[PDB]
Protein backbone atom coordinates (compact mmCIF):
# COMPACT_ATOMS: atom_id res chain seq x y z
CA UNK A 1 0.00 0.00 0.00
CA UNK A 2 1.01 3.63 -0.58
CA UNK A 3 0.72 6.19 2.23
CA UNK A 4 0.69 9.93 1.52
CA UNK A 5 1.99 12.27 4.23
CA UNK A 6 1.16 15.98 4.41
CA UNK A 7 3.23 18.66 6.11
CA UNK A 8 3.42 22.44 6.34
CA UNK A 9 0.45 23.50 8.45
CA UNK A 10 1.64 26.96 9.47
CA UNK A 11 -0.20 30.14 10.40
CA UNK A 12 0.20 33.00 7.91
CA UNK A 13 -1.70 36.29 8.06
CA UNK A 14 -2.97 38.14 5.00
CA UNK A 15 -0.21 38.40 2.41
CA UNK A 16 1.87 35.64 3.98
CA UNK A 17 3.28 32.58 2.24
CA UNK A 18 3.48 28.97 3.41
CA UNK A 19 4.56 25.72 1.75
CA UNK A 20 2.55 22.49 1.82
CA UNK A 21 4.43 19.25 1.09
CA UNK A 22 2.84 15.94 0.07
CA UNK A 23 5.21 12.96 0.15
CA UNK A 24 4.30 9.53 -1.23
CA UNK A 25 5.83 6.49 0.46
CA UNK A 26 6.25 2.91 -0.72
CA UNK A 27 7.36 1.57 -4.09
CA UNK A 28 5.58 3.45 -6.89
CA UNK A 29 6.66 3.04 -10.50
CA UNK A 30 5.13 6.38 -11.55
CA UNK A 31 2.40 8.90 -10.71
CA UNK A 32 -0.03 9.98 -13.43
CA UNK A 33 -0.86 13.30 -11.75
CA UNK A 34 -0.81 14.97 -8.33
CA UNK A 35 -3.52 17.44 -7.35
CA UNK A 36 -4.28 19.75 -4.42
CA UNK A 37 -7.91 20.17 -3.32
CA UNK A 38 -9.36 22.80 -0.98
CA UNK A 39 -12.20 21.87 1.40
CA UNK A 40 -14.03 24.47 3.48
CA UNK A 41 -16.18 23.53 6.49
CA UNK A 42 -19.36 24.60 4.69
CA UNK A 43 -18.44 24.38 0.99
CA UNK A 44 -18.02 21.48 -1.41
CA UNK A 45 -14.70 20.08 -2.61
CA UNK A 46 -12.87 22.30 -5.11
CA UNK A 47 -9.64 21.48 -6.90
CA UNK A 48 -6.79 23.95 -6.34
CA UNK A 49 -3.85 22.70 -8.42
CA UNK A 50 -2.96 19.81 -10.71
CA UNK A 51 0.43 18.73 -12.08
CA UNK A 52 0.93 15.87 -14.54
CA UNK A 53 3.87 13.60 -15.31
CA UNK A 54 4.28 15.51 -18.58
CA UNK A 55 4.82 18.80 -16.75
CA UNK A 56 1.41 20.28 -17.57
CA UNK A 57 0.12 22.54 -14.79
CA UNK A 58 -3.56 23.37 -14.26
CA UNK A 59 -4.83 26.02 -11.85
CA UNK A 60 -8.23 27.42 -10.95
CA UNK A 61 -9.20 30.87 -12.18
CA UNK A 62 -8.82 32.40 -8.71
CA UNK A 63 -5.88 30.17 -7.75
CA UNK A 64 -3.80 31.42 -10.68
CA UNK A 65 -1.29 34.09 -9.71
CA UNK A 66 -1.11 33.10 -6.02
CA UNK A 67 -0.20 29.39 -5.79
CA UNK A 68 2.64 27.47 -7.43
CA UNK A 69 2.99 23.69 -7.82
CA UNK A 70 6.14 21.62 -8.26
CA UNK A 71 6.30 17.81 -8.14
CA UNK A 72 9.38 15.60 -8.42
CA UNK A 73 8.81 12.10 -9.79
CA UNK A 74 12.17 10.76 -8.62
CA UNK A 75 11.43 12.31 -5.22
CA UNK A 76 7.74 11.41 -5.90
CA UNK A 77 6.70 14.41 -3.79
CA UNK A 78 4.72 17.56 -4.57
CA UNK A 79 5.21 21.01 -3.03
CA UNK A 80 2.59 23.78 -3.22
CA UNK A 81 3.76 27.29 -2.33
CA UNK A 82 0.86 29.56 -1.35
CA UNK A 83 2.32 32.95 -2.18
CA UNK A 84 0.17 35.94 -1.19
CA UNK A 85 -2.21 33.80 0.86
CA UNK A 86 -5.69 35.35 1.10
CA UNK A 87 -8.13 35.18 4.04
CA UNK A 88 -10.88 33.60 1.93
CA UNK A 89 -9.00 30.35 1.21
CA UNK A 90 -8.76 29.40 4.88
CA UNK A 91 -9.94 25.86 4.08
CA UNK A 92 -8.18 22.57 4.74
CA UNK A 93 -6.07 21.05 1.97
CA UNK A 94 -5.84 17.51 0.62
CA UNK A 95 -3.55 15.83 -1.91
CA UNK A 96 -4.55 13.25 -4.51
CA UNK A 97 -2.47 10.83 -6.58
CA UNK A 98 -4.92 9.90 -9.33
CA UNK A 99 -2.62 7.24 -10.78
CA UNK A 100 -0.61 5.02 -8.41
CA UNK A 101 0.98 2.11 -10.29
CA UNK A 102 2.90 0.19 -7.63
CA UNK A 103 4.96 -2.64 -9.15
CA UNK A 104 6.70 -5.22 -6.97
CA UNK A 105 9.95 -6.94 -8.00
CA UNK A 106 8.11 -10.27 -8.21
CA UNK A 107 5.96 -8.84 -11.02
CA UNK A 108 2.70 -8.32 -9.11
CA UNK A 109 1.39 -4.76 -8.97
CA UNK A 110 -1.62 -2.62 -8.17
CA UNK A 111 -3.25 0.48 -9.67
CA UNK A 112 -5.71 2.25 -7.35
CA UNK A 113 -6.40 5.60 -5.68
CA UNK A 114 -5.08 6.70 -2.28
CA UNK A 115 -5.88 9.71 -0.10
CA UNK A 116 -3.51 11.62 2.15
CA UNK A 117 -4.65 13.09 5.45
CA UNK A 118 -5.46 16.77 5.24
CA UNK A 119 -3.23 19.64 6.33
CA UNK A 120 -4.79 22.28 8.57
CA UNK A 121 -4.23 25.74 7.06
CA UNK A 122 -6.11 28.93 7.94
CA UNK A 123 -5.66 32.70 7.83
CA UNK A 124 -6.55 35.24 10.52
CA UNK B 1 -34.85 21.59 8.44
CA UNK B 2 -32.06 21.65 11.05
CA UNK B 3 -28.71 23.30 10.35
CA UNK B 4 -25.66 24.47 12.31
CA UNK B 5 -23.18 27.28 11.68
CA UNK B 6 -19.92 27.74 13.59
CA UNK B 7 -17.75 30.82 13.97
CA UNK B 8 -14.92 32.35 15.97
CA UNK B 9 -12.15 30.10 14.67
CA UNK B 10 -9.04 32.26 14.36
CA UNK B 11 -5.29 31.71 14.57
CA UNK B 12 -4.16 32.29 18.17
CA UNK B 13 -0.68 32.13 19.67
CA UNK B 14 -0.02 29.94 22.72
CA UNK B 15 -1.43 31.54 25.85
CA UNK B 16 -4.09 33.44 23.89
CA UNK B 17 -7.84 32.98 23.90
CA UNK B 18 -10.68 32.73 21.38
CA UNK B 19 -14.46 32.36 21.74
CA UNK B 20 -15.87 29.59 19.55
CA UNK B 21 -19.56 29.97 18.70
CA UNK B 22 -22.20 27.57 17.36
CA UNK B 23 -25.60 28.81 16.19
CA UNK B 24 -28.41 26.45 15.23
CA UNK B 25 -31.65 26.85 13.31
CA UNK B 26 -34.56 24.41 13.19
CA UNK B 27 -34.95 23.62 16.91
CA UNK B 28 -34.82 25.27 20.34
CA UNK B 29 -31.44 25.02 22.02
CA UNK B 30 -32.80 24.66 25.56
CA UNK B 31 -34.69 21.44 24.74
CA UNK B 32 -31.60 19.61 23.42
CA UNK B 33 -28.01 19.16 24.58
CA UNK B 34 -25.01 20.21 22.47
CA UNK B 35 -21.52 18.73 22.28
CA UNK B 36 -18.18 19.83 20.84
CA UNK B 37 -15.86 17.35 19.12
CA UNK B 38 -12.16 17.82 18.39
CA UNK B 39 -10.64 16.33 15.22
CA UNK B 40 -6.98 16.64 14.34
CA UNK B 41 -6.05 16.27 10.65
CA UNK B 42 -5.90 12.53 10.02
CA UNK B 43 -6.76 11.56 13.61
CA UNK B 44 -9.89 10.04 15.10
CA UNK B 45 -12.61 12.38 16.33
CA UNK B 46 -12.78 12.92 20.09
CA UNK B 47 -14.97 14.78 22.59
CA UNK B 48 -13.89 17.91 24.48
CA UNK B 49 -17.00 19.57 25.95
CA UNK B 50 -20.68 18.84 26.44
CA UNK B 51 -23.59 20.97 27.67
CA UNK B 52 -26.86 19.31 28.66
CA UNK B 53 -30.29 20.50 27.57
CA UNK B 54 -30.96 22.08 30.97
CA UNK B 55 -27.61 23.88 30.87
CA UNK B 56 -26.99 23.69 34.62
CA UNK B 57 -24.37 20.93 34.19
CA UNK B 58 -21.45 20.71 31.76
CA UNK B 59 -18.78 18.08 31.20
CA UNK B 60 -15.18 18.25 29.94
CA UNK B 61 -12.30 15.83 29.41
CA UNK B 62 -9.01 15.55 31.28
CA UNK B 63 -6.93 17.12 28.50
CA UNK B 64 -8.89 20.39 28.49
CA UNK B 65 -10.20 20.20 32.07
CA UNK B 66 -10.33 23.56 33.82
CA UNK B 67 -9.72 25.58 30.63
CA UNK B 68 -13.03 25.66 28.74
CA UNK B 69 -16.09 27.70 29.74
CA UNK B 70 -19.12 26.38 27.84
CA UNK B 71 -22.14 28.69 27.84
CA UNK B 72 -25.55 28.81 26.17
CA UNK B 73 -27.82 31.66 25.05
CA UNK B 74 -31.47 31.01 24.21
CA UNK B 75 -32.11 34.56 22.99
CA UNK B 76 -29.20 34.23 20.55
CA UNK B 77 -29.96 30.50 20.09
CA UNK B 78 -26.20 29.96 20.24
CA UNK B 79 -23.72 28.06 22.38
CA UNK B 80 -20.19 29.30 23.05
CA UNK B 81 -16.93 27.68 24.14
CA UNK B 82 -13.92 29.43 25.67
CA UNK B 83 -10.31 28.29 25.52
CA UNK B 84 -8.51 30.12 28.39
CA UNK B 85 -4.78 29.66 27.57
CA UNK B 86 -4.26 27.78 24.31
CA UNK B 87 -1.80 24.90 23.99
CA UNK B 88 -0.46 23.03 20.94
CA UNK B 89 -2.67 20.04 21.80
CA UNK B 90 -5.67 22.17 20.73
CA UNK B 91 -4.45 22.35 17.12
CA UNK B 92 -7.37 20.16 16.02
CA UNK B 93 -10.52 21.56 14.42
CA UNK B 94 -13.82 21.78 16.30
CA UNK B 95 -17.23 20.42 15.27
CA UNK B 96 -20.63 21.17 16.80
CA UNK B 97 -22.98 18.23 17.34
CA UNK B 98 -26.66 18.30 18.34
CA UNK B 99 -28.75 15.11 18.16
CA UNK B 100 -32.25 16.55 17.92
CA UNK B 101 -33.17 13.85 15.42
CA UNK B 102 -31.22 11.24 13.45
CA UNK B 103 -27.67 12.67 13.66
CA UNK B 104 -26.51 16.16 12.67
CA UNK B 105 -22.93 17.35 12.12
CA UNK B 106 -22.02 21.02 12.05
CA UNK B 107 -19.79 22.45 9.36
CA UNK B 108 -17.15 23.27 11.97
CA UNK B 109 -14.37 25.83 12.31
CA UNK B 110 -10.60 25.42 12.30
CA UNK B 111 -8.47 26.26 15.33
CA UNK B 112 -4.69 25.80 15.20
CA UNK B 113 -2.43 27.31 17.84
CA UNK B 114 0.64 27.14 15.58
CA UNK C 1 -29.32 -11.25 -3.22
CA UNK C 2 -32.49 -12.43 -4.96
CA UNK C 3 -33.91 -13.33 -1.54
CA UNK C 4 -33.69 -9.72 -0.34
CA UNK C 5 -35.38 -8.24 -3.42
CA UNK C 6 -38.37 -6.33 -2.08
CA UNK C 7 -39.42 -6.31 1.58
CA UNK C 8 -38.23 -8.92 4.08
CA UNK C 9 -39.61 -9.45 7.60
CA UNK C 10 -37.05 -9.41 10.41
CA UNK C 11 -37.24 -11.18 13.78
CA UNK C 12 -34.63 -10.79 16.52
CA UNK C 13 -34.20 -12.65 19.82
CA UNK C 14 -31.66 -11.66 22.47
CA UNK C 15 -30.94 -13.24 25.87
CA UNK C 16 -28.40 -11.20 27.84
CA UNK C 17 -26.88 -11.81 31.29
CA UNK C 18 -25.31 -8.59 32.59
CA UNK C 19 -23.66 -9.27 35.96
CA UNK C 20 -26.38 -11.73 36.95
CA UNK C 21 -29.27 -9.66 35.55
CA UNK C 22 -30.98 -11.76 32.87
CA UNK C 23 -33.04 -9.94 30.23
CA UNK C 24 -34.81 -11.27 27.13
CA UNK C 25 -35.60 -8.95 24.21
CA UNK C 26 -37.87 -9.87 21.29
CA UNK C 27 -37.97 -7.66 18.21
CA UNK C 28 -40.01 -7.63 15.02
CA UNK C 29 -40.17 -5.48 11.92
CA UNK C 30 -39.36 -5.14 8.24
CA UNK C 31 -36.41 -4.32 6.02
CA UNK C 32 -35.94 -3.14 2.43
CA UNK C 33 -32.42 -4.09 1.34
CA UNK C 34 -32.90 -2.37 -2.02
CA UNK C 35 -33.29 1.02 -0.33
CA UNK C 36 -31.15 0.05 2.67
CA UNK C 37 -33.99 0.70 5.13
CA UNK C 38 -34.65 -1.13 8.41
CA UNK C 39 -37.77 -0.47 10.52
CA UNK C 40 -37.78 -2.56 13.70
CA UNK C 41 -39.20 -2.61 17.22
CA UNK C 42 -37.27 -4.46 19.95
CA UNK C 43 -39.58 -4.85 22.95
CA UNK C 44 -37.93 -6.13 26.12
CA UNK C 45 -39.92 -9.18 27.23
CA UNK C 46 -38.82 -8.65 30.83
CA UNK C 47 -40.27 -5.86 32.94
CA UNK C 48 -37.31 -3.53 32.39
CA UNK C 49 -33.96 -3.51 30.62
CA UNK C 50 -31.12 -3.31 33.19
CA UNK C 51 -28.88 -1.49 30.67
CA UNK C 52 -29.47 1.50 28.38
CA UNK C 53 -31.02 0.73 25.01
CA UNK C 54 -28.21 2.37 22.96
CA UNK C 55 -25.72 -0.14 24.36
CA UNK C 56 -27.77 -3.02 22.94
CA UNK C 57 -28.72 -1.24 19.70
CA UNK C 58 -25.37 -2.35 18.27
CA UNK C 59 -25.91 -5.93 19.46
CA UNK C 60 -29.43 -6.13 18.02
CA UNK C 61 -29.40 -4.17 14.75
CA UNK C 62 -25.79 -4.34 13.55
CA UNK C 63 -26.07 -8.11 13.77
CA UNK C 64 -28.44 -7.71 10.82
CA UNK C 65 -26.14 -6.00 8.30
CA UNK C 66 -27.44 -7.99 5.31
CA UNK C 67 -30.00 -5.26 4.53
CA UNK C 68 -27.24 -2.72 3.85
CA UNK C 69 -27.49 -0.99 0.47
CA UNK C 70 -24.40 -2.20 -1.40
CA UNK C 71 -23.65 -0.26 -4.63
CA UNK C 72 -23.80 -2.19 -7.90
CA UNK C 73 -20.03 -2.54 -8.29
CA UNK C 74 -19.92 -3.54 -4.60
CA UNK C 75 -22.79 -6.05 -4.88
CA UNK C 76 -20.33 -8.95 -5.05
CA UNK C 77 -18.70 -7.68 -1.84
CA UNK C 78 -21.77 -8.39 0.33
CA UNK C 79 -20.61 -11.36 2.40
CA UNK C 80 -23.78 -11.28 4.50
CA UNK C 81 -26.07 -11.77 1.50
CA UNK C 82 -23.76 -14.42 0.03
CA UNK C 83 -23.76 -16.48 3.24
CA UNK C 84 -27.28 -15.56 4.39
CA UNK C 85 -29.18 -18.52 2.83
CA UNK C 86 -27.40 -20.96 5.15
CA UNK C 87 -26.92 -18.35 7.89
CA UNK C 88 -23.83 -17.28 9.78
CA UNK C 89 -22.44 -16.90 13.30
CA UNK C 90 -21.32 -13.51 14.63
CA UNK C 91 -19.27 -13.09 17.82
CA UNK C 92 -18.84 -9.57 19.22
CA UNK C 93 -16.41 -8.41 21.89
CA UNK C 94 -17.17 -4.89 23.08
CA UNK C 95 -14.79 -3.05 25.42
CA UNK C 96 -16.25 0.03 27.09
CA UNK C 97 -14.08 2.94 28.17
CA UNK C 98 -13.17 1.64 31.64
CA UNK C 99 -16.69 0.24 32.17
CA UNK C 100 -16.35 -3.50 31.55
CA UNK C 101 -17.01 -5.60 28.48
CA UNK C 102 -19.82 -7.26 26.54
CA UNK C 103 -19.37 -10.65 24.88
CA UNK C 104 -22.14 -11.70 22.50
CA UNK C 105 -22.76 -14.64 20.18
CA UNK C 106 -25.44 -14.43 17.49
CA UNK C 107 -26.81 -16.78 14.84
CA UNK C 108 -28.45 -15.28 11.74
CA UNK C 109 -30.53 -17.55 9.53
CA UNK C 110 -33.67 -17.85 7.44
CA UNK C 111 -36.53 -19.81 9.02
CA UNK C 112 -39.65 -20.37 6.97
CA UNK C 113 -39.76 -17.07 5.09
CA UNK C 114 -38.40 -14.77 7.81
CA UNK C 115 -34.95 -13.74 9.02
CA UNK C 116 -34.15 -14.79 12.59
CA UNK C 117 -31.35 -13.58 14.88
CA UNK C 118 -30.71 -15.64 18.02
CA UNK C 119 -28.41 -13.62 20.30
CA UNK C 120 -26.82 -14.43 23.67
CA UNK C 121 -25.13 -11.59 25.56
CA UNK C 122 -22.98 -11.47 28.70
CA UNK C 123 -21.56 -8.33 30.30
CA UNK C 124 -18.80 -8.44 32.92
CA UNK C 125 -16.44 -6.14 34.82
CA UNK C 126 -19.08 -3.45 35.35
CA UNK C 127 -18.93 -0.64 37.90
CA UNK C 128 -22.08 0.60 39.60
CA UNK C 129 -22.98 4.28 39.11
CA UNK C 130 -21.14 4.22 35.77
CA UNK C 131 -22.17 5.51 32.37
CA UNK C 132 -23.91 2.26 31.41
CA UNK C 133 -25.08 0.89 34.76
CA UNK C 134 -26.00 4.39 35.92
CA UNK C 135 -28.39 4.85 32.96
CA UNK C 136 -26.78 8.25 32.32
CA UNK C 137 -26.87 7.54 28.58
CA UNK C 138 -29.55 9.50 26.76
CA UNK C 139 -31.97 7.56 24.56
CA UNK C 140 -30.48 8.30 21.15
CA UNK C 141 -28.06 6.63 18.74
CA UNK C 142 -25.66 8.53 16.49
CA UNK C 143 -24.51 7.67 12.98
CA UNK C 144 -21.38 5.55 12.90
CA UNK C 145 -18.93 3.68 10.67
CA UNK C 146 -17.99 -0.01 10.72
CA UNK C 147 -14.79 -1.16 9.01
CA UNK C 148 -14.91 -4.60 7.39
CA UNK C 149 -11.98 -6.81 6.35
CA UNK C 150 -11.65 -10.42 5.23
CA UNK C 151 -9.82 -13.28 6.95
CA UNK C 152 -9.06 -16.42 4.94
CA UNK C 153 -7.49 -18.27 7.88
CA UNK C 154 -10.83 -18.19 9.71
CA UNK C 155 -12.76 -18.10 6.41
CA UNK C 156 -14.79 -15.22 7.82
CA UNK C 157 -15.28 -11.47 7.92
CA UNK C 158 -13.97 -9.27 10.75
CA UNK C 159 -15.30 -5.85 11.72
CA UNK C 160 -13.86 -3.06 13.84
CA UNK C 161 -15.25 0.26 15.00
CA UNK C 162 -15.76 2.76 17.81
CA UNK C 163 -19.23 3.75 19.02
CA UNK C 164 -19.89 7.16 20.55
CA UNK C 165 -22.55 7.10 23.28
CA UNK C 166 -23.98 10.39 24.53
CA UNK C 167 -24.48 11.03 28.25
CA UNK C 168 -26.81 13.27 30.22
CA UNK C 169 -23.89 15.19 31.75
CA UNK C 170 -22.55 15.85 28.23
CA UNK C 171 -19.75 13.29 28.29
CA UNK C 172 -19.26 11.04 25.26
CA UNK C 173 -18.17 7.44 25.89
CA UNK C 174 -16.07 5.61 23.29
CA UNK C 175 -16.71 1.86 23.10
CA UNK C 176 -14.52 -0.41 20.98
CA UNK C 177 -16.43 -3.05 18.99
CA UNK C 178 -14.76 -6.08 17.40
CA UNK C 179 -16.74 -8.57 15.31
CA UNK C 180 -15.83 -12.04 14.03
CA UNK C 181 -17.96 -14.00 11.56
CA UNK C 182 -18.10 -17.69 10.66
CA UNK C 183 -20.16 -18.89 7.65
CA UNK C 184 -22.52 -21.68 8.72
CA UNK C 185 -22.99 -22.81 5.14
CA UNK C 186 -20.29 -24.68 3.24
CA UNK C 187 -20.88 -22.70 0.05
CA UNK C 188 -18.44 -20.10 -1.27
CA UNK C 189 -18.08 -17.23 1.18
CA UNK C 190 -17.39 -14.55 -1.46
CA UNK C 191 -15.53 -12.54 1.17
CA UNK C 192 -14.91 -8.87 0.25
CA UNK C 193 -11.92 -6.57 0.59
CA UNK C 194 -11.73 -3.65 3.04
CA UNK C 195 -14.90 -1.57 3.09
CA UNK C 196 -16.72 0.73 5.51
CA UNK C 197 -20.45 0.71 6.27
CA UNK C 198 -22.05 4.00 7.33
CA UNK C 199 -25.13 3.63 9.59
CA UNK C 200 -27.77 6.35 10.39
CA UNK C 201 -30.00 5.60 13.45
CA UNK C 202 -33.11 7.59 14.59
CA UNK C 203 -34.90 6.24 17.73
CA UNK C 204 -38.55 6.71 18.78
CA UNK C 205 -41.31 5.46 21.07
CA UNK C 206 -44.75 4.36 19.94
CA UNK C 207 -47.71 5.85 21.87
CA UNK C 208 -49.87 2.73 22.01
CA UNK C 209 -47.56 0.17 23.63
CA UNK C 210 -47.17 0.62 27.38
CA UNK C 211 -44.14 -1.68 27.38
CA UNK C 212 -40.76 -0.45 26.17
CA UNK C 213 -41.11 0.49 22.50
CA UNK C 214 -37.52 0.76 21.22
CA UNK C 215 -38.72 1.79 17.75
CA UNK C 216 -35.70 1.98 15.44
CA UNK C 217 -35.32 3.36 11.90
CA UNK C 218 -31.92 2.61 10.38
CA UNK C 219 -30.25 3.25 7.02
CA UNK C 220 -26.96 1.45 6.33
CA UNK C 221 -24.89 2.10 3.20
CA UNK C 222 -21.64 0.38 2.25
CA UNK C 223 -18.76 2.27 0.64
CA UNK C 224 -14.98 2.45 0.43
CA UNK C 225 -14.61 0.56 -2.86
Author numbering:
A (entry chain K): 1 to 124
B (entry chain D): 1 to 52, 52A, 53 to 82, 82A, 82B, 82C, 83 to 110
C (entry chain B): 5 to 229
Give the text the authors published on this PDB structure.
Here, we show that a generic and kinetically biased ‘Gembody’ (Gb) interface, previously discovered through trapping in crystallo, can also be trapped in solution by kinetically controlled side-chain-to-side-chain bond formation in a manner that leads to ready generation of complexes; these display ideally balanced interface flexibility and yet relative complex constraints, in turn allowing rapid cryo-EM structure determination, even of small targets. Ultimately, after a survey of in-solution covalent bond-forming methods exploring differing natural and unnatural amino acid residues, we found that Cu(II)-catalyzed oxidation at a pivotal C12 residue site (together with the presence of needed Gb ‘gem’ substitutions previously discovered through iterative X-ray-guided engineering) offered a route to direct and rapid, high-yielding formation of disulfide-linked homo Di-Gembody (homoDiGb) without side reactions (for example, off-site oxidation) to form a robust covalent interface. Furthermore, the success of DiGbs for high-resolution structural solution is enabled by their relatively small mass contribution to the imaged complex while increasing the maximum particle diameter for better particle alignment. In summary, our plug-and-play DiGb strategy improves cryo-EM resolvability and resolution of small proteins through constraint and increased particle size with a simple and robust workflow and can even enable simultaneous structure determination of two challenging targets in one dataset.
Strikingly, using sequential purification, we generated heteroDiGbs bound to two distinct targets. Moreover, when we locally refined each target separately, we found much-improved individual maps of 3.03 Å for RECQL5 and 2.99 Å for sfGFP. A potential caveat to our Gb technology is the possibility for clashes between targets, which we observed for homoDiGb analysis of sfGFP and overcame through the use of an alternative heteroDiGb system. Alignment of a previously determined NbEnhancer:sfGFP complex to our determined homoDiGb structures suggested that the two target molecules would likely clash in the homoDiGb complex despite flexibility of the intra-DiGb angle. By contrast, heteroDiGbs constructed from NbEnhancer and the RECQL5 nanobody yielded high-resolution results.
